[PDB]
Amino acid sequence: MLDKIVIANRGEIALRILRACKELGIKTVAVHSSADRDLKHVLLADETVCIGPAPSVKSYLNIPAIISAAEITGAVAIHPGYGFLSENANFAEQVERSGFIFIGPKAETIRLMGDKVSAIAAMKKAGVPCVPGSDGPLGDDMDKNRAIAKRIGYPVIIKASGGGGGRGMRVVRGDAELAQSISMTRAEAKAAFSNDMVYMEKYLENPRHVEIQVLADGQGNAIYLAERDCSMQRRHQKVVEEAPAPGITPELRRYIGERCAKACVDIGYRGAGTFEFLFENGEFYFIEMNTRIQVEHPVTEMITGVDLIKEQLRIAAGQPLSIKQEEVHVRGHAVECRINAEDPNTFLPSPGKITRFHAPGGFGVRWESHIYAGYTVPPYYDSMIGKLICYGENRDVAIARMKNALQELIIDGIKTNVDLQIRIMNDENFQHGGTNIHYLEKKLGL
Numbered sequence: 001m002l003d004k005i006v007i008a009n010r011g012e013i014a015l016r017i018l019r020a021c022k023e024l025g026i027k028t029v030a031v032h033s034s035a036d037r038d039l040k041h042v043l044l045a046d047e048t049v050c051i052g053p054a055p056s057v058k059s060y061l062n063i064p065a066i067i068s069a070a071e072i073t074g075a076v077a078i079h080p081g082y083g084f085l086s087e088n089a090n091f092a093e094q095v096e097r098s099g100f101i102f103i104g105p106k107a108e109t110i111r112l113m114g115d116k117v118s119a120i121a122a123m124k125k126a127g128v129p130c131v132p133g134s135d136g137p138l139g140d141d142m143d144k145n146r147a148i149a150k151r152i153g154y155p156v157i158i159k160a161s162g163g164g165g166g167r168g169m170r171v172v173r174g175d176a177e178l179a180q181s182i183s184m185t186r187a188e189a190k191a192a193f194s195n196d197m198v199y200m201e202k203y204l205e206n207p208r209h210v211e212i213q214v215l216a217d218g219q220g221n222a223i224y225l226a227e228r229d230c231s232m233q234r235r236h237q238k239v240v241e242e243a244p245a246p247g248i249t250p251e252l253r254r255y256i257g258e259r260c261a262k263a264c265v266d267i268g269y270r271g272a273g274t275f276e277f278l279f280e281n282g283e284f285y286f287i288e289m290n291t292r293i294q295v296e297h298p299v300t301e302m303i304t305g306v307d308l309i310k311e312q313l314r315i316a317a318g319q320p321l322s323i324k325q326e327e328v329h330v331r332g333h334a335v336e337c338r339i340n341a342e343d344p345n346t347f348l349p350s351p352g353k354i355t356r357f358h359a360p361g362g363f364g365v366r367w368e369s370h371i372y373a374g375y376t377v378p379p380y381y382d383s384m385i386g387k388l389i390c391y392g393e394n395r396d397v398a399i400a401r402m403k404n405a406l407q408e409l410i411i412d413g414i415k416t417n418v419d420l421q422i423r424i425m426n427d428e429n430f431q432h433g434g435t436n437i438h439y440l441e442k443k444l445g446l
């Protein structure tokens, strides 16, 4: 087991990582900005290092400062959490070059999945179903681009190969708009990644966002831990996630899961990872892979019993997977509601001091948050201040528990999205299940 690690993150995920470290007897180093001195995990950590001022560029994205903190404390590994530098291949490379373990895959693997075109090519080769597409970057030959579009069939979508999460894409519905659409996507990509590479996919009109959790030890062992539906979202931000995905049969799960696991072996994947799919008309289509642990990991933990963070730490210590595929069993159902400090009318972050706090408790209730009474939510970071996760023996039980936990939750002094979460739990279409990626924005437009 790793002697000591730097937790290269903040907020709820840093606390989540700290708890796993403590379970495993791993010493903790909490690196933090000057605005984050009173973070719960910082107060709980074995050692603390202030790595810079409030803005993320000079703290949580400050590669030399994070590496120096590992150096000064004699840490053996760095956990990047999610966001920040977790998908930064240069950071992973610098971490290993400086002589520390990066808790994540090889830098080459991060780089491979970071490039959307190369990622899809690798996944297609491995037998993972992808969206019908260009299978390569689009060039300047518009005859060739029209032929790709015809072969695929309109509508199509132009996507940037550098891009993440849905940044800068456009739907094309005929030849008439194709040339300009390619042109425009190229330009926005140049500003975002200094990379004008674009590709084409068949545009799916009303898909669900379904992602497969994997773990791989780098020793040839790779398992899939069912799936999560993340379709409930607003402006590229997930709002509610759940596991398993409604309507997914054991057979479909096994079909897609085995293909993801085999792909992990093909690419020499190491650690936790997520294969993101679009799901429409009973069919899976790979869009991208996340090579980090994700915000929504807890729903997968509830339905499988596998502690994904502890697995990351075990794998980073060079241990083989703690379980075989045949030992992974989907049981019950879990729903996560993200709790955001945000104004309900503007959807802008709403920072400030929490004056009264009470966490929900009870059977099947899991509360993931650094917040406490008297804690000030700083203006400098993301709006998500906690995650409420409810498990039950079935989806209806999980939802009923979530409704009650949400009503029990008290966060006074700041504005939150609790009332919206309650609305969603009471939504008849959500109660039925299987709503698509466009649903919440359509609902909120009414």
Ligand SMILES: Cc1nc(-c2ccnc(N)n2)cn1Cc1c(Cl)cccc1Cl
Pocket (backbone or CB within 6 Å): 131, 157, 165, 166, 201, 202, 203, 204, 205, 207, 209, 231, 233, 236, 278, 287, 437
């Ligand atoms: C990365 C990505 N690809 C798509 C997409 C949608 C329809 N067809 C195709 N091919 N891709 C959508 N997104 C981003 C996204 C996702 Cl993945 C989930 C909800 C909303 C949004 Cl805008």
Ligand SMILES: [Cl-]
Pocket (backbone or CB within 6 Å): 082, 083, 293, 294, 295, 296
């Ligand atoms: Cl994430």
